[PDB]
């Protein structure tokens, strides 16, 4: 579990979105595992606007923050699941690190702010859904 609260928006993994999230829908992309819904209160999360490849993410399964090196956002193959058929997920960044299914939602940050959220993992790797290109989150 986990969300990014920036201004009047809540950004969550599309596979984990609630009824409230779909009833207050702004944007959703199944191929990115992202869903953005509207909130009635203000959010103070800063979104990073950068090309950073290092940062720190929260791993709920270890109750710990881990520093990571990660790749550029890209189309990576993701295996089938109860949420999606086997497909290419776009805007995905991979890093070597620990993750478990309940780890989706954990925030990845750099010196400039929120980079993205945990969306995939397995085999000693963690995948992050990038949010740095969604410029409308701050406007
Ligand atoms: C079950 O595989 C692992 C293993 C380690 C870590 C993790 Cl987060 C998972 C879960 C995983 O990657 N999923 C399940 C939920 C939807 C994700 C997606 N974005 O398509 C794909
Ligand atoms: Zn950065």
Structure description:
It catalyses: Selective cleavage of Tyr-|-Gly bond in the picornavirus polyprotein. This is Protease 2A. Homodimer. The PDB classes it as hydrolase. There is one protein chain. With about 140 residues, this protein is mainly β. It folds into two domains: about 5-45, no CATH class; about 45-139, no CATH class. The chain has one helix and ten strands; from the N terminus they run βαβββββββββ. It has one helix spanning about 20-25, and strands at about 5-15, 25-30, 35-45, 55-60, 65-70, 75-80, 85-95, 105-110, 115-120, 125-130. A seven-stranded antiparallel sheet has the order 5-4-8-9-10-7-6, with no helix packed on it. The chain has a three-stranded antiparallel sheet with strand order 1-3-2. It binds ligand A1BPX and zinc ion (ZN). Zinc ion binds near residues 48, 50, 52, 110 and 112.
What are the defining features of this structure?
mainly beta; Protease 2A; binds the ligand COc1cccc(Cl)c1CC(=O)N1CCC[C@H](C(N)=O)C1; 2 domains; binds zinc ion; 3-stranded antiparallel beta sheet; 139 residues; hydrolase; monomer
Question: How are the SSEs ordered, and which strands pair?
Answer:
Elements: E1 4-13, H1 19-23, E2 25-29, E3 34-44, E4 54-59, E5 64-69, E6 74-78, E7 87-96, E8 107-110, E9 113-122, E10 125-130
The structure holds the ligand COc1cccc(Cl)c1CC(=O)N1CCC[C@H](C(N)=O)C1 and zinc ion.
Short description:
The chain is mainly beta.
């Amino acid at each position: 579990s986990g969300a990014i609260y920036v201004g009047n928006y809540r950004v969550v993994n599309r596979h984990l979105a609630t009824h409230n999230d779909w009833a207050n829908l702004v944007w959703e992309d199944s191929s990115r595992d992202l869903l953005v819904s509207s909130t009635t209160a203000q959010g103070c999360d800063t979104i990073a606007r950068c090309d950073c490849q290092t940062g720190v993410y929260y791993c709920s399964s270890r109750r710990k923050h881990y520093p990571v090196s990660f790749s550029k956002p890209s189309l990576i193959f993701v295996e089938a699941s109860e949420y999606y058929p086997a497909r290419y997920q776009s805007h995905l960044m991979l890093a070597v690190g620990h993750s478990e299914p309940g780890d989706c939602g954990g925030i990845l940050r750099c010196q400039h702010g929120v980079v993205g959220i945990v969306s995939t993992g397995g085999n000693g790797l963690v995948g992050f859904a990038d949010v740095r290109d969604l410029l409308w989150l701050d406007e």
